[PDB]
Design a protein around this ligand. Sequence first.
Ligand SMILES: NS(=O)(=O)c1cc2c(cc1Cl)N[C@H]([C@H]1C[C@H]3C=C[C@@H]1C3)NS2(=O)=O
Ligand SMILES: N[C@@H](CCC(=O)O)C(=O)O
Lengths: 50, 236, 184, 232, 147, 49, 44
Amino acid sequence: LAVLKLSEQGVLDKLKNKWWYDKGECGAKDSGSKEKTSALSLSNVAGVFY
Amino acid sequence: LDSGSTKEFFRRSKIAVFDKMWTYMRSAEPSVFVRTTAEGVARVRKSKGKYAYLLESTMNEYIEQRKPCDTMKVGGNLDSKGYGIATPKGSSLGTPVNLAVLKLSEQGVLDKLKNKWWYDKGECGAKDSGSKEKTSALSLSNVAGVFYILVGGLGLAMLVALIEFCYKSRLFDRGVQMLLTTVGAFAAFSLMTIAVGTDYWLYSRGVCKTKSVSEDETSKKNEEVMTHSGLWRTCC
Amino acid sequence: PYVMMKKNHEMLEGNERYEGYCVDLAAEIAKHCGFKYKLTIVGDGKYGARDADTKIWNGMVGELVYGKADIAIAPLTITLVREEVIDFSKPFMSLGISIMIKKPQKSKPGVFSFLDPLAYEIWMCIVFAYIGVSVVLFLVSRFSPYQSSESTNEFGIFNSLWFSLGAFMQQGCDISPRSLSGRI
Amino acid sequence: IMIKKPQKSKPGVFSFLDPLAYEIWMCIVFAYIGVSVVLFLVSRFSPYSSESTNEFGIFNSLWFSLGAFMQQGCDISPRSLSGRIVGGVWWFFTLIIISSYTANLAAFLTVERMVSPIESAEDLSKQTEIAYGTLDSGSTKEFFRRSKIAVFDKMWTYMRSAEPSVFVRTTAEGVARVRKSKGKYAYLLESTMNEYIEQRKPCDTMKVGGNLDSKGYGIATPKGSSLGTPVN
Amino acid sequence: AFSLMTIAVGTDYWLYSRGVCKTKSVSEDETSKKNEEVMTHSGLWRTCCLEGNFKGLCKQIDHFPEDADYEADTAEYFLRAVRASSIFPILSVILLFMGGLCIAASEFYKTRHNIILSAGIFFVSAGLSNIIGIIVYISANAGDPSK
Amino acid sequence: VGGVWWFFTLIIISSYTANLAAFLTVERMVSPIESAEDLSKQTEIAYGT
Amino acid sequence: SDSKKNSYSYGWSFYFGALSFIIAEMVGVLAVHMFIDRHKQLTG
Ligand SMILES: NS(=O)(=O)c1cc2c(cc1Cl)N[C@H]([C@H]1C[C@H]3C=C[C@@H]1C3)NS2(=O)=O
Ligand SMILES: N[C@@H](CCC(=O)O)C(=O)O
């Protein structure tokens, strides 16, 4: 009954999401580049400007 | 929904995000609550993205796999719930029914039956149209702006030629040039000092006084808010 | 798709009347445990809720409490008040509240789509670099060559603009620098 | 697996005119003519023999735009400010159009296969858009119902729910059922029959993937037949 | 050329396609069976079908629909309003008429010497309006192509 | 004459430089000998038994 | 990749630095023209 009560108050959720996400000081970066190909960046060509 | 488990959870929600949703729902006209779920599905489709519906994930997946395939599930699970087989107290088969659920889960038959009925018996079956990869000829509309710029460049060229022809049918001075050069030099120095000195270079999400101390973890830290970062300073 | 009426359900009778995922699940729970099962659809068609003043579980939870129904292989969420009276299984399938939007119609009539592969920063830097190269070339050439040698070259500031643009557009230009720093 | 062949479309002598739509080729010629006319109009306004200083006649102006469009370049160069305006905009127009043609032409040169046909029976299983049938009272049909390979069992499942009935009566009818559906439908039979029929007319069939199993055809005698051992 | 442009405006044979004819001109029609969309001579404003049971009848195109399947895009809204209110082809005809006035008065109004010059400007400016009216017509036909 | 030659050279070079990089870094095997009848008509590659 | 969540926007300070660039290039060209007249005056 205790586990059910915490789940219906989100206490299981609140404890879980607080510990995992906030101790993630490292950026998650599961995304990276979601699209396969993307526009040119200034960083790829900034030396030519220099 | 007008009356449902979704209705009750956001009532019980203490999250500020969910409460702001819940404040909108109590005070929005036309009434955002719908009498039945099938009504809300038709209402979202009729309202063309201006109205969106909150419903359970398995229902939303089912609506997508049917036709006219015109609804999209987005987001993650707001909260987690479960579907449990119900048996009365002192159930004769109740514990073996639990063991039967565990066996079908571990054998994967629960998911295999689940993955079949939603994604194959569904009319849409969008894997086929999603697998369409065909390069094509460019259309005119794909490059239509380039044609527009050419025409606009043509008409501008005519207009400049006409006004130049009028002006030729009708004298720059050196002292005027010296005065203009003095004014330009003072202004360009002024613009450059303001730009480097005052700090409004970038408007983006950035770290403010909620985490002005970078060292303090301060659990959620209010992730990062709008920030007028600049060359010498970062400010929110 | 938990329970489904087929176009031949009018023909079919008994357990064969209804099909679906939970109907499959009812059949699967049957063969593991070993019980003959009778499929019924409740008339109220509402999820189990204890009422305000009659205080009767409405629908499937009432029929299990009141002995009529033996089991509920049904899309029934586990709540506190329901679990308190009758025991549930561990949840066979999970659910979450989800957002549904009408699918946004997809096309890019991009009209200025030609300047898409380079970002607008890069276009801005090119225009600044275009103006810089044109000015430097004019400053290089008309930097006191020595009457005539001042006026020998055709690279004025207006011509210096034109030279660099044709060079950028991969188009041949009429004039050529003919000075060492200018040719650099 | 027996499916209908894809079309080996024979491109005409104007295959180069493929990356741009024929409307665009019309629009380019129309834009070519207008710019050349405008540039001649710009070059000759009777300025204030000042018009004679410009070398741009219409025939020069046709010539300048063509060298711009073909990117080869021309000797003459516009020297009036509006004359430089029309040229530079047309240069910017050309730069997009020619490059977009070469980029798409490179894309059309890169041709690849297996996208339009079905890769194998797992790809038949992944999409029921191309349905499939088996021969009536055949060992082929009896194999798929009794082979518990997971692709085969899902393939037997759609065989159970298939309308109109994918099973055919004879071999030639099932062959004809591939043809009559215009590539929207596939069929299953033995490899040796399929190899003969694909080498016969109207030569519009081919075998995707490979044979899923290996089997044999043997001379058949009754159980305990006296002639069983000599025919062995 | 003024005559050619006016006949072009005043006709409905711009595009031939398998478009909706008068049987499905009535919206949400029942038991028409979609009528298999016989040939339609689309026009500058007219959606009249040809070679049909219901040819000979003319209805104007209404490019703005009752129901917008896509969410209303501002740049597309501008482009449609250009095509429906076909002001660029209309302005072309006017500039053709203005040059034709200048051509008629070119013999008269001596010592201006710029009437013929004003005619040539009008002739090019009419021609520029023709191309952009052509382009939006191709762009509109590309917009919602079909199946 | 120059115009038609200019249209010619545009098509040919764009065709030539379409996928030119892919025809300098193909390292694929020649595999000159294929079948038995191909093995039969030559003696330079010997038969082993 | 587009940093749409970051939604980076170049404020008025960034535009003014661009304006400082454009004016300074214009002033430099005008300055050279004044020299060319004066250097031509020196020849005369
Ligand atoms: N994919 S599914 O619906 O078949 C499915 C659904 C669920 C599974 C396992 C599967 Cl395979 N695990 C849990 C249950 C299985 C055991 C582990 C946790 C409980 C007991 N319930 S669930 O979260 O409802
Ligand atoms: N050899 C097969 C031929 C028919 C079939 O492939 O179904 C048989 O006798 O069954």
